[PDB]
Nucleic acid binder design. Structure first.
Ligand SMILES: [Mg+2]
Ligand SMILES: [Mg+2]
Ligand SMILES: [Mg+2]
Ligand SMILES: [Mg+2]
Ligand SMILES: [Mg+2]
Ligand SMILES: [Mg+2]
Ligand SMILES: [Mg+2]
Ligand SMILES: [Mg+2]
Ligand SMILES: [Mg+2]
Ligand SMILES: [Mg+2]
Ligand SMILES: [Mg+2]
Ligand SMILES: [Mg+2]
Ligand SMILES: [Mg+2]
Ligand SMILES: [Mg+2]
Ligand SMILES: [Mg+2]
Ligand SMILES: [Mg+2]
Ligand SMILES: [Mg+2]
Ligand SMILES: [Mg+2]
Ligand SMILES: [Mg+2]
Ligand SMILES: [Mg+2]
Ligand SMILES: [Mg+2]
Ligand SMILES: [Mg+2]
Ligand SMILES: [Mg+2]
Ligand SMILES: [Mg+2]
Ligand SMILES: [Mg+2]
Ligand SMILES: [Mg+2]
Ligand SMILES: [Mg+2]
Ligand SMILES: [Mg+2]
Ligand SMILES: [Mg+2]
Ligand SMILES: [Mg+2]
Ligand SMILES: [Mg+2]
Ligand SMILES: [Mg+2]
Ligand SMILES: [Mg+2]
Ligand SMILES: [Mg+2]
Ligand SMILES: [Mg+2]
Ligand SMILES: [Mg+2]
Ligand SMILES: [Mg+2]
Ligand SMILES: [Mg+2]
Ligand SMILES: [Mg+2]
Ligand SMILES: [Mg+2]
Ligand SMILES: [Mg+2]
Ligand SMILES: [Mg+2]
Ligand SMILES: [Mg+2]
Ligand SMILES: [Mg+2]
Ligand SMILES: [Mg+2]
Ligand SMILES: [Mg+2]
Ligand SMILES: [Mg+2]
Ligand SMILES: [Mg+2]
Ligand SMILES: [Mg+2]
Ligand SMILES: [Mg+2]
Ligand SMILES: [Mg+2]
Ligand SMILES: [Mg+2]
Ligand SMILES: [Mg+2]
Ligand SMILES: [Mg+2]
Ligand SMILES: [Mg+2]
Ligand SMILES: [Mg+2]
Ligand SMILES: [Mg+2]
Ligand SMILES: [Mg+2]
Ligand SMILES: [Mg+2]
Ligand SMILES: [Mg+2]
Ligand SMILES: [Mg+2]
Ligand SMILES: [Mg+2]
Ligand SMILES: [Mg+2]
Ligand SMILES: [Mg+2]
Ligand SMILES: [Mg+2]
Ligand SMILES: [Mg+2]
Ligand SMILES: [Mg+2]
Ligand SMILES: [Mg+2]
Ligand SMILES: [Mg+2]
Ligand SMILES: [Mg+2]
Ligand SMILES: [Mg+2]
Ligand SMILES: [Mg+2]
Ligand SMILES: [Mg+2]
Ligand SMILES: [Zn+2]
Lengths: 206, 155, 60, 97, 83, 23
RNA sequence: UGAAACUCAAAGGAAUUGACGGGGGCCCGCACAAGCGGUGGAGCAUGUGGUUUAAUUCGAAGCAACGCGAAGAACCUUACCAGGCCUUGACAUGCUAGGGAACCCGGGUGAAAGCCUGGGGUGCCCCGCGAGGGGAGCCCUAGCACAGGUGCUGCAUGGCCGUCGUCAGCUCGUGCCGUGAGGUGUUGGGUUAAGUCCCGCAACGAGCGCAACCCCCGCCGUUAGUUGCCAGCGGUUCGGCCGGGCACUCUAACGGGACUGCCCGCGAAAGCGGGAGGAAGGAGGGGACGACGUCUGGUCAGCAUGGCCCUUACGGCCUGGGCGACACACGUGCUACAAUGCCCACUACAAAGCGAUGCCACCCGGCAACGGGGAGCUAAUCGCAAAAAGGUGGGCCCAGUUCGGAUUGGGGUCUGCAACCCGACCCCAUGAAGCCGGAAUCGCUAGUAAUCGCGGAUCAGCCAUGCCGCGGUGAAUACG
């Protein structure tokens, strides 16, 4: 049990923080808590939409939440129905001026957290895990990625003996700083237990 | 080490006599990295040997060194089912290290109460050929000659 | 004895000594950082995600 | 002296004494047994008897396993002896040439 | 020990009962959990039962044991020796 | 040395002050 | 010459991939050697095995458990014990019915919790000049679903970590060889820190590792000049204090710089040896970074999670106790046994950090811990702050001592509701073992070891001699 988290390893090199602001010693914690609660609510509500990243900004008494997603419509609604509904649920929790944006995920099959969740969904549907993993990777490479690696660990297929299955294509140079690699994790709850899913997408090096 | 023959550290010549050998001796005196202390002790000793016997301390020191240098030593080697004490010539680098080491150690087995004094006197005896330092050298040599018969096991 | 404890830690006590930090994320009573409100494990978990502003792997 | 650990198990002074009489077989070799340490443990398959002992000529590390805690201990002893006998005699092998 | 600038600490709920018994004339047994309370001159001659975590230990207070704490006389560990 | 409170060195090691190490 | 009873589910041949060998060859690593300092002995601090206990919660187990989870156990924490209590319940989502909502304030009983109870005014959209009639803002009371469980299983698991190992390795595609496992490539010759690179080759490529891309440090430049700096000229209360300036130091962002690039030599090449230039030379020093996998490794007690188990209790609140016990045993550390030392007095030289119920100048009371005054600082401004070893002087004179500072008596301080169990600190007195440690055993190859102090997280306080950092002084040695 070894490998460093491929995102935290690239913060401020190939990858940027998800909560971008400044706060002083007396304040930092409380903002951070609210920040996570914002993610808590949205992670539940926006799941069906195809949630990939949740950026957060702050100045003074006002905050801007930018939601990246594969299905922008499922967020916005009919002419703004759910999009409006959100601000109210939002600024109730926030208790402050909570600007909610939405933005496209141009290629969900090049978004690692998306690929990960899809396979996790597939294996809660009792699909063939190995066949799935090869597929996921096949999708990501077709969509143009320079390399891909997907991993599933647990009681695979229901087996009593836990095992780890993975598949990979092209390059995935986890040791290279300047290599841009999107990473994502998805939890698959089954009747026999939890499976962990990890997706690595190598978009390219910078 | 395994790959290459390591590099002998070139020391910086001492401030008072301009001598790499003196510097080396100082460091051997030096406990806990207190080199100022170490420096004084030697130089204080250098003062003392001048008072007791009016000569060049440097000359005394260097003569004492050449007197404690073992020219031959025994190094064990287990050949077959027995450990033979094989007689070996000492490299000049090693002769120096052993000489300076024994000088300080024998010094610090002496009974007089101040280090500078012990360091002084031991350097005086070793210069004249007396003292535990030279005794060490004489012994090491005698062991080597005593086992001259095993000098063909030399590597 | 856990959820009752993450709860009892919230309510103000009978005496101010009895107050102690719990990790607001996982409820951990030990190795809780004041600055974040988080324990050493959560501190690491969020930081690796990049969800701690300005925080990054420190190397020198 | 000799230490015995019973990991996530309860044992008696009797059982502890038994182990001491069993390790005692190693006294045969007339060499110093330095801080012998026995760890008794229960797996689903049976018991496990671990031991680490140092001697002037090396360390002894052995693990014994068996449904019967005493047999597990006996096999531990058997593995320890074989090691101790090698430690004590391996040097004699190459006395010639 | 406790700052002299501050008080001589008795838990008030223990102390109150002492003075109550002093007035009417003492004494019934007093069960207390207040190990932290100082034996106080008003308490002398009483017998206070001090809970040690398990049992309430009957302690007859005397002139010698004034300055101390109540816990000091109801030991909390059973130790009869080894082997 | 460092273990004796009634000395300067002891109060340094311990990080306190007093008669034997005043400020 | 040659059975049988009985018994076993194999006995076997060859070959394959491993692993192992007291088989061989060639290599590497503080692995040995060479060194320097320790541990094992003492006293003490701390973890653990045991034993004790009402309980002394629980895990960790050779290396890779044992100053480990614990980056702060008096209450709290706390998961254990004893006792006193609560029953949709400390907490979620409900649906229903009574009360008034909502929020505050006291009284009784009690160790507290809890039980008992006496206070007092609910907006709304509403028939409201009127009793009166709600709805759901939130609580209360009675239900039923449900909560809650640090109860079990790390041998059902996710996650994250440890380890072998920063070791140089582990494989795939297609082709070729083999009936087949599987081989080849990846082996071989040279080379490298390296499956690094070169040459050769039924192999030709590719991937994960290696390296590089990132951070700190070392030289230089550019941009900046305060709260930082002061070379020079003025004042100079006698202090970069003032004028002034940003040169220098610095601070912190961006660049330059080293590539075996250049000469000699050996090389088939890759490279190696030597030289110059240069602050830096052959990865410049350190850091981050850990392949396929192994240990049915570790963690259900950080979290999540399958399943099994508890439901007026295996849930929940409180007071007290325990986690701090002590015939013993081991691990990690602190301080030592002294003169290269100890003590006093005076006097220099850091870095990185931290600081608004905080850091505290300076003043005064106290031998002191500390206390009372009181300025400054949202801090390159002000503060912690003094760094210590060192330096200069003076004392000690080889003694269980002016070494050592354990143990105990007495007196105080501070935190805290509260220091009996069970806090740290100060002062007076006491002044133990210990005269350099058996078998055995640990660390370190250079700004390293050793030695010296400073900071921080946790934190009311602290059992920190721990941990993570920071600079000061600064070695010995490596044949092999
Ligand atoms: Mg020496
Ligand atoms: Mg000698
Ligand atoms: Mg002679
Ligand atoms: Mg319980
Ligand atoms: Mg829980
Ligand atoms: Mg607290
Ligand atoms: Mg805490
Ligand atoms: Mg034992
Ligand atoms: Mg046990
Ligand atoms: Mg037992
Ligand atoms: Mg084992
Ligand atoms: Mg046998
Ligand atoms: Mg054998
Ligand atoms: Mg003393
Ligand atoms: Mg037959
Ligand atoms: Mg065979
Ligand atoms: Mg071999
Ligand atoms: Mg080593
Ligand atoms: Mg060695
Ligand atoms: Mg040694
Ligand atoms: Mg030490
Ligand atoms: Mg020792
Ligand atoms: Mg010891
Ligand atoms: Mg334990
Ligand atoms: Mg126990
Ligand atoms: Mg245990
Ligand atoms: Mg457990
Ligand atoms: Mg602690
Ligand atoms: Mg407690
Ligand atoms: Mg409690
Ligand atoms: Mg496991
Ligand atoms: Mg696991
Ligand atoms: Mg286990
Ligand atoms: Mg064949
Ligand atoms: Mg074929
Ligand atoms: Mg093959
Ligand atoms: Mg092939
Ligand atoms: Mg290979
Ligand atoms: Mg191969
Ligand atoms: Mg080769
Ligand atoms: Mg390497
Ligand atoms: Mg390569
Ligand atoms: Mg080849
Ligand atoms: Mg610098
Ligand atoms: Mg400039
Ligand atoms: Mg070179
Ligand atoms: Mg690398
Ligand atoms: Mg296991
Ligand atoms: Mg769990
Ligand atoms: Mg479970
Ligand atoms: Mg079922
Ligand atoms: Mg309690
Ligand atoms: Mg307690
Ligand atoms: Mg404990
Ligand atoms: Mg014992
Ligand atoms: Mg011992
Ligand atoms: Mg310690
Ligand atoms: Mg020790
Ligand atoms: Mg003596
Ligand atoms: Mg004495
Ligand atoms: Mg004695
Ligand atoms: Mg004395
Ligand atoms: Mg006292
Ligand atoms: Mg206490
Ligand atoms: Mg020693
Ligand atoms: Mg010593
Ligand atoms: Mg030995
Ligand atoms: Mg090294
Ligand atoms: Mg010292
Ligand atoms: Mg410190
Ligand atoms: Mg602090
Ligand atoms: Mg603290
Ligand atoms: Mg203590
Ligand atoms: Zn946490």
């Amino acid at each position: 049990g070894n490998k460093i988290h491929p995102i935290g390893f690239r913060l401020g090199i190939t990858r940027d923080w998800e909560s971008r602001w400044y706060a002083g010693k007396k304040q930092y914690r409380h903002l951070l808590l609210e920040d996570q609660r914002i993610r808590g609510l949205l992670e539940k509500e926006l799941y069906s939409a195809g949630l990939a990243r949740v950026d957060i900004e702050r100045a003074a008494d006002n905050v801007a939440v930018t939601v990246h997603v594969a299905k922008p419509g499922v967020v916005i609604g009919r002419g703004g129905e759910r999009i409006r509904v959100l601000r109210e649920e939002l600024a109730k929790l926030t208790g402050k001026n909570v600007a909610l944006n939405v933005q496209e995920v141009q290629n969900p099959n090049l978004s690692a957290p998306l690929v990960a969740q899809r396979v996790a969904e597939q294996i809660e549907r009792r699909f063939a895990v190995r066949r799935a993993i090869k597929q996921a990777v096949q999708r990501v490479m077709e969509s143009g990625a320079k390399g891909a690696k997907v991993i599933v660990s647990g009681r695979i297929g229901g087996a009593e003996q836990a095992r780890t299955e993975w598949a990979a294509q092209g390059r995935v140079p986890l040791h290279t700083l300047r290599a841009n690699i999107d990473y994502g994790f998805a939890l698959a709850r089954t009747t026999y237990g939890v499976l962990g899913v990890k997706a690595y997408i190598f978009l390219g090096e910078v | 080490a395994r790959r290459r023959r390591a590099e002998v550290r070139q020391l910086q010549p001492d401030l008072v006599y301009g001598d790499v050998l003196v510097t080396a001796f100082i460091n051997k005196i030096m406990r806990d990295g207190k080199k100022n202390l170490a420096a004084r002790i030697f130089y204080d000793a250098c003062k003392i040997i001048q008072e007791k016997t009016g000569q060049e301390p440097l000359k005394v020191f260097k003569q004492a060194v050449e007197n404690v240098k073992p020219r031959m030593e025994v190094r064990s080697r287990r050949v077959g089912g027995a450990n033979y004490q094989v007689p070996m010539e000492v490299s000049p680098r090693r002769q120096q290290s052993l000489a300076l080491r024994w000088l300080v150690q024998a010094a610090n087995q002496r009974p007089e109460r101040r280090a500078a004094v012990r360091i002084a006197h031991e350097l005086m005896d070793a210069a004249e050929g007396k003292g535990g330092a030279v005794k060490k050298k004489e012994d090491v040599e005698r062991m080597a000659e005593a086992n001259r018969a095993y000098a063909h096991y030399r590597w | 004895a856990r959820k009752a404890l993450i709860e009892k830690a919230k309510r103000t006590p009978k005496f101010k000594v009895r107050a102690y930090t719990r990790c607001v994320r996982c409820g951990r009573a030990r190795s809780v950082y004041r600055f974040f409100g988080l324990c050493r494990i959560c501190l690491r978990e969020l930081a690796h995600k990049g969800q701690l502003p300005g925080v990054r792997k420190a190397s020198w | 002296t000799m230490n015995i650990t019973s990991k996530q198990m309860e044992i008696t002074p009797a059982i502890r004494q038994h182990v001491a009489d069993r390790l005692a077989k190693l006294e045969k070799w007339q060499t110093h047994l330095i801080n012998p340490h026995i760890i008794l443990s229960k797996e689903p398959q049976g018991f496990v008897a671990d031991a680490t002992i140092n001697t002037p000529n090396g360390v002894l590390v052995a693990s014994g396993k068996h449904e019967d805690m005493y047999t597990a201990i006996n096999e531990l002893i058997n593995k320890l002896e074989r090691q101790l006998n090698k430690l004590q005699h391996k040097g004699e092998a190459r006395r010639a040439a | 020990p406790r700052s002299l600038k501050k008080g001589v600490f008795v838990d008030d709920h223990l102390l109150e009962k002492v003075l109550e018994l002093n007035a009417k004339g003492e004494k019934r047994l007093i069960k207390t959990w207040s190990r932290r309370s100082t034996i106080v001159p008003e308490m002398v001659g009483h017998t206070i039962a001090v809970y040690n975590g398990k049992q309430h230990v009957p302690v007859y207070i005397t002139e010698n044991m004034v300055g101390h704490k109540l816990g000091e006389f109801a030991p909390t560990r059973t130790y009869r020796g080894h082997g | 040395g460092k273990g004796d409170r009634r000395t300067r060195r002891g109060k340094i090691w311990r990080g306190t002050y007093g008669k034997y190490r005043p400020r």
